[model samples]
Target chain A: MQDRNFDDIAEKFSRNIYGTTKGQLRQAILWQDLDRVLAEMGPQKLRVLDAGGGEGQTAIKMAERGHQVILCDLSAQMIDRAKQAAEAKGVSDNMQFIHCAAQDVASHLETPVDLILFHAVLEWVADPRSVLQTLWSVLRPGGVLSLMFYNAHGLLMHNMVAGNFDYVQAGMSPDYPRDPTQVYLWLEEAGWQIMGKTGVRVFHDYLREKHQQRDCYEALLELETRYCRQEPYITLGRYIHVTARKP
Target chain B: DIAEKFSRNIYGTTKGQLRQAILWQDLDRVLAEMGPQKLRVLDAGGGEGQTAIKMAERGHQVILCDLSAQMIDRAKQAAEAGVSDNMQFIHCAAQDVASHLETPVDLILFHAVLEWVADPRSVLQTLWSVLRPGGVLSLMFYNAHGLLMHNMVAGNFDYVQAGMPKKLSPDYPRDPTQVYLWLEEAGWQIMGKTGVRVFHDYLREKHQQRDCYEALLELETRYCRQEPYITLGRYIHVTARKPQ
Candidate 1:
């Protein structure tokens, strides 16, 4: 299978994914994690690599936080969008953009980075294991890896709740979603110590479509944030955020 | 201690019915594959003898064993069911089943007993020895993942986050994959796997009424054999062969 390139759907993806409450919940939970990690790591101007960083939402945020950022993506359109976003935010000087797949990111890095953001990319990739290993090699000792991906458990639950039993019965086709437990095993197998795990959008996606409106967004976000790190709920997140340190 | 509660509260519920339906469907397939021969069956720690009695009724010589004398006494329902001649009841722990048997049997049913035992692996090993070559092992155990999800969805975050202390669930709910590994390690060739109560227990209370029970059962049975869904089953049933 080929890695997904968002060149064709760059505009649609930005509008649909990042321009809604779904996007809001994702950003809130992601940064709630990253902010805490960055705070614990102290005030050093560390190097951050956003592998398949997409529209550079996180890349620009890291650059804005006074850290040098490298944003890489397979989609040139997405890289261009991120460039525009960084320039508009005046963090372009603190950031670099590369149009390449996450697997080819090591060749572009000058030295090992202090942190790597691999979010929402694994689901689209052809080979997640190889990409994760490559990221591990590009991270310095004692540095942290912020890994996130679409969860297979959540995907199945979503379809089941949506009454898509036939699709599920047919074996969940185009099976790209990763099991959170399996992902944890892979990280531990690679010698990375899992520091913490949080589920992004655990409760929001499971909400009936009617209840998933603007009125309930804040309440939903609050509840999601509250139990994101807890077991059971954490595994049920549409996207799982796992922070591991390279010890 | 929990035995009476299980009989009173669990057996008649939609959750229990769905679980029985899924298990019997899979078990019937395994029995069909074993052919029409009258086989010897042992229900290790089989509570109430529901399965043991059913096997006995089918003309199979069945042994129903449990650590709880209370449970074995209840399993005397086999006599009431008129299958007493085809069955035997032994009050003892599953670990001691081999010592009571003269020869290894053709089939073993060790259901819902692994999680409560102190040494599950040892019990598995013991059962492995008590099964004759080419025998079948119908194993079922509470799934740890399902227990976690059940508590989580029920909004028991404090209990779950606290590492699910003893009072919360069974003594030791095991990860199904780990149990599968243990089965393979004991030289059992897995033949079939089915998830009991895959979605029934997860449904909201309002949706779990008698009116929708059949629909829910249909939905559960359709996906119980599928992956990711099956992995989240409240109880996992795996039928395996002991190799000739």
Candidate 2:
């Protein structure tokens, strides 16, 4: 758990956000929310910053929408893989992949961006707050920020559910963990408003591996989109996806 | 009775919950960011005085102005129930705001009233006149894009293209981009523009009926600025400030 390097997990991480049934379900919910937002935002070329967009899964999606995406990651392998995928998706022309830490974005991106995405990147960073502040500085006023992080609360839930009492008690993980409430307070302090936070894999993490059955997973996904933002289920998402704004 | 019906339907039911939540949340951020200043606020077209009352409770002087006597009367009743010492009322329309309050004020709220006015831009000019340089204006309006999307979602495709019906609605949907430009031309700078109710109505009936309305609200809050979501919000909330 001491290792902070993401090189080892780059492929698996990308696979999880794409290849796995659960990962695909997470993307389905994310895409649903984003698709609505984009359709409402109307058609326009946008400059997007996908901080820590591992293997370019989301970057490619944004690029496919005709937005210019700058994908940054700590792992060179992840960035390289994202570059290859972007090419394969025929979106390489619209992307600029960078190898850098989250906190070092301002130095790399001089121009203000309309949107900044930090999906599943915060917990892995050495300093989440500083990284957020860095991201905030380059975000144009009225710009949108998409943040996804491993939920500490979900970690506890998973540990307890899995009967891993020791891990739950230790409250430890290689990646620095944060609770949703703590993130809320941080965003507020940064003078940002948390527009919404929907649970990604809120219920999926608890489902049996056997539930990966086509019909069962389909039903679960349908139910997830329905209740991801609903009460009890919202607090239990394995990863919390929050969209905040720089007011 | 269109005005009465419109007002009643919007303000008298749970329908107001979503709208109120958006406006109140925006105002809360605006106020909190101002820190401990006990400044005055002009709640122009502030129907029923809920916003005015909240401002007064937070230790700020407030003037509750509305075109409708009925709304002002209700606001008065509510104001009296709370602490009315820090509050005043004016039964005037947005265009008449400058005449009633000659002196500049610290804040102005043009929430949910611009669309109902004869000219939203002119009304904004009038409201901006009463604002002291360095003062802030909290504005919220019905979004046109959302109207189309919601109508389409409801299977009323014709209405989406044709716009709101003639009789029951008082909405004159506003485009945040256009409004932002207008504010700039009027010598005001936008501080922030956020979408409200970005997800509530987007989801189907059963999704909305969840016991976790607060959670839905939280989710809605996060998406208020993310586009397509921001554009699709039932309302667009914007805050602008006059330069000192």
Candidate 3:
């Protein structure tokens, strides 16, 4: 069911993002966000999809909290790694994964999910509305859909003006950056209430800040994590963190 | 002027380009995947020393070295800030491995700084020479193929602003066999390698084509690590070990 060009691009960069190198970064962001969701859920968020998830740290984390989760993606490599990592991390019992697209979430499975995660995924897709639509359909009623995407109005924009275009263009940014309006429209059309949509890293926070005198980057990242949603920083961010729900 | 560039580079996600920083952290996966033990190690250009701090945090005894006085200084500051003795920093050129390191080193790492050196082979050979028997060398390099694709396919002018038609991309062997031979001759064995982000650069142009990205994101991870295919990634990566 995958279009040739769609399969081609996805196939080309899957190794790059889900490869051994980028996997850690992917896990870090996904796991941290899941940590937040899990804390709120408190002891088993019960059933999730690390959608676009090659390796599901979120599902693993949730499973560790005693919730059942699924590590899934359209790429076989990612599915393979997620399965392996689940075993290695010792959360294999709590998680199951499939190699499938985000749009194909519900039809191929019988399980109902409490949460649908789209970490670092919104911007890469062409018809985000359909993706969201698929996400809403697969999720149980009142399920939360968590998403992270490049914030067009954020520091990445500032960086582009500062001559870091190699970093910019290399990140796979396209001609028209994704905006809140488009995202909101898509979410609304999918019948999901926008619980909250806040930008992350308005001040250009990074994973390496811990390498500074501030201590390990994790602490600073957490602090930045706390500060990301409110204040002057969100006004300008490299990415946004959205939590929406299907009523 | 140096400080400016240094600060910019120091922040992995700078240029408002946090996504690039996103791409840069793939090392974390390699760490988890390698079951990294923080064994005896060397950071070829341990700029500003944050990496040494990371290694020390992970309990790895590490040696940090760089060719730049400025980079060495910043790395020193980083090591001092981290305040761990498990790591040490050294000032050395890329080509002077025999003098700076004993042969058959455990792991020689070259971070985001490999492209600037005038002698790429001398550097890679230096890495190969330092590995102790069965020691591995982890490396990252800018890909000429991705540069070319971006220029011709994406039609993005900004990349052309600096390295037009892959000129500044270094003319070292683009063929995998050539690099494999370099590793073999330098006393190393091929183990793992991948190209990083062959199509994501096109997604960068997709600025509006948000629908089309996950394909590339997943493709990058799958193929970027595949030897022959990763040639198209934005960067080429290799893990070569000294024969045991």
Cα DockQ of the candidate 3 complex: 0.01
Tens-place lDDT per residue, model 1, A106-176, is: 89888899999999888887788899899999999999999998998787777665555566667633348
- DockQ of all candidate complexes: 0.08, 0.01, 0.01
State how far residue A88 of model 2 sits from its true place (Å).
Answer: 28
The candidate that achieves the highest DockQ relative to the unseen native structure: 1
lDDT, candidate 2, B1-244, per-residue tens: 4443443343344346666766777788888887877988999888888778878998899998888999988998998886789988898877887788858899898777866766888888887788888899998887776665455444343343344565437556777677778889999988887887765664444234233355555555665665435666777888988998
Residue B30 error for model 2, in Å?
2.0
Task: For each candidate, give the interface RMSD after superposing the true interface residues on Cα.
Answer: 5.2, 14.3, 16.4
In model 3, the runs with Cα more than 4 Å from the true position are: A1-247, B1-38, B102-104, B112-114, B156-177, B204-219, B227-229
Ordering by TM-score: 1, 2, 3
**Top of the candidates by lDDT:** 1
Residue B236, model 3, lDDT: 67
Q: Which runs in model 2 stand beyond 4 Å of their true positions?
A: A1-247, B1-15, B165-168, B207-210
Q: Candidate 3: lDDT of A116? A: 78
Give the CAPRI rating of model 3. incorrect
Residues forming the 10-long window of minimal summed lDDT in candidate 3 chain B: B13-22
Q: Which stretches of candidate 1 lie above 4 Å from their native place? A: A1-56, A67-153, A161-237, A240-247, B1-11, B204-215
